[PDB]
Write a protein that binds this ligand. Structure first.
Ligand SMILES: O=C(O)[C@H]1O[C@H](O[C@@H]2[C@H](O)[C@@H](O)[C@@H](O[C@@H]3[C@H](O)[C@@H](O)[C@@H](O)O[C@@H]3C(=O)O)O[C@@H]2C(=O)O)[C@H](O)[C@@H](O)[C@H]1O
Ligand SMILES: [Ca+2]
Ligand SMILES: [Ca+2]
Ligand SMILES: [Ca+2]
Length: 399
């Protein structure tokens, strides 16, 4: 079968659980689309009621920041009449505003502006849908696919630059504050039975090295690459190439969201993370199988410096096997970041700079996460992960 009609293998990660992930493989003839612009993509997807099995082939580049006539849209097109970046910056400067939450005219105008862009860039994927790239050059630019539904396959697409014209300032996000933006390449918001395979995720033409710092903090226009939230469950992400991006994959969006416990069952395998800063993945609560992934970067990089690979967040249950991390000078301990509530990590065969390490022991974590994955394909020897992943991960490696 071609990529449009292929289903997730019956053993291929958490996505294969129960009813499995078949996406739109069973689509009848009038439910197979080929789309080459935003108008065509939106028409094909339809609304949440569009639950028939459907296949969507993406041909070439789909820019999501466009109007109904496909004319490109920018900051000034989206901007609320009351919003002004200079006045936003002056309103909320820590020096005069302090550390209280931005409120009042400029923040309300920014929030309205942000909703104006969201209306164009964010698109919901309905149940029983396969979206695949035709050829080696299928691209989604500026777009945020949201999956709240069940049974969705996304393959062979390069997602670039999910860009927010209206980052919000948070003075109490960390000790010196942070700017936060809204758009991921893919947001799994309570979505279930999902396969993301052979995709590429990057910051396109506008990497973070092109944004200034305001209040000493990067004016961050991006958010996640593949995020999973609000009871998202039964997901396989395989052979994807994540590169040149800050916060990659946050699974579980809140320590308060205790309903995520027993959910966020996600398998990550054969993914490449090159020049990714953090959250690869960052996990709260979930039983996440992480195997045969390759991580490569530099702590001294001026564009996207490596901070950590795995985020051991509150009640996380990461099961890691034969992953390979190549970050010069990095200690075994610093491969991961442990957050409050995170006490356990299973990792075997972890290679750091060619040397076998124990990331869990190096961080005083428990070695048991209370589960062992039964749904997985063949496990590569760590010795072969770098070659296999570089050669195979990402869009355009199949077509
Ligand atoms: O699903 C989301 O995108 C999620 O994003 C925010 O949260 C994440 C993370 O869950 C938060 O803990 C927070 O991260 C911390 C710092 O802000 C960040 O600079 C870095 O140091 O990591 C910290 C951490 O891992 O805890 O912010 C994250 C982010 O900016 O994406 C939203 O707060 C959350 O509501 C949700 O949208
Ligand atoms: Ca943040
Ligand atoms: Ca975020
Ligand atoms: Ca997000």
């Amino acid at each position: 079968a071609d990529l449009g009609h292929q289903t997730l293998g019956s053993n291929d990660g958490w996505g294969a659980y129960s009813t499995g992930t078949t996406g739109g493989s069973k689509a009848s003839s009038s439910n197979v689309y080929t789309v080459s612009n935003r108008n065509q993509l939106v028409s094909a997807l339809g609304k949440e009621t569009n639950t028939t099995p459907k296949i969507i082939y993406i041909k070439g580049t789909i820019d999501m920041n466009v109007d109904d006539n496909l004319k490109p849209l920018g900051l000034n097109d989206y901007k609320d009449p009351e919003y002004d970046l200079d006045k936003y910056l002056k309103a909320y400067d820590p020096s005069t505003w302090g550390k209280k939450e931005p409120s009042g005219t400029q923040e309300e105008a920014r929030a309205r502006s942000q909703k104006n862009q969201k209306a164009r860039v964010m698109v919901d994927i309905p149940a029983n849908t396969t979206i695949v790239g035709s050829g080696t050059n299928a691209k989604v630019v500026g777009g945020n696919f949201q999956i709240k539904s069940d049974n969705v396959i996304i393959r062979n697409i390069e997602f670039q630059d999910a860009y927010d014209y209206f980052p919000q300032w948070d003075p109490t996000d960390g000790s010196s504050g942070n700017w936060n933006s809204q758009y991921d390449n893919i947001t799994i918001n309570g979505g279930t039975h999902i396969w993301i395979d052979h995709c590429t995720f990057n910051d396109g033409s506008r990497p973070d090295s092109t944004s200034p710092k305001y209040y000493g903090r990067k004016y961050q226009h991006h958010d996640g690459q593949t995020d999973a939230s609000n009871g998202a469950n039964y997901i396989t992400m395989s052979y994807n190439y994540y590169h040149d991006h800050d916060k990659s994959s946050i699974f579980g969006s809140s320590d308060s969201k205790t309903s995520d416990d027993g959910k966020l069952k996600i398998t990550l395998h054969h993914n490449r993370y090159k020049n990714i800063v953090q959250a690869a993945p960052r996990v709260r609560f979930g039983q996440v199988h992480v195997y045969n992934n390759y991580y490569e970067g530099s702590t001294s990089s001026s564009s996207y410096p490596f901070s950590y690979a795995w985020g051991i967040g509150k009640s996380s249950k990461i099961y890691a096997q034969n992953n390979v991390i190549d970050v010069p000078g990095l200690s075994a301990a610093k491969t991961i970041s442990v957050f409050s509530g995170g006490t356990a990590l299973y990792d075997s065969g972890t290679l750091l700079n060619g040397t076998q390490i124990n990331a869990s022991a190096a961080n005083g974590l428990s070695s048991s996460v209370g589960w062992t994955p039964s749904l997985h394909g063949s496990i590569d020897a760590s010795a072969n992960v770098k070659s296999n992943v570089i050669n195979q991960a990402g869009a355009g490696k199949l077509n």
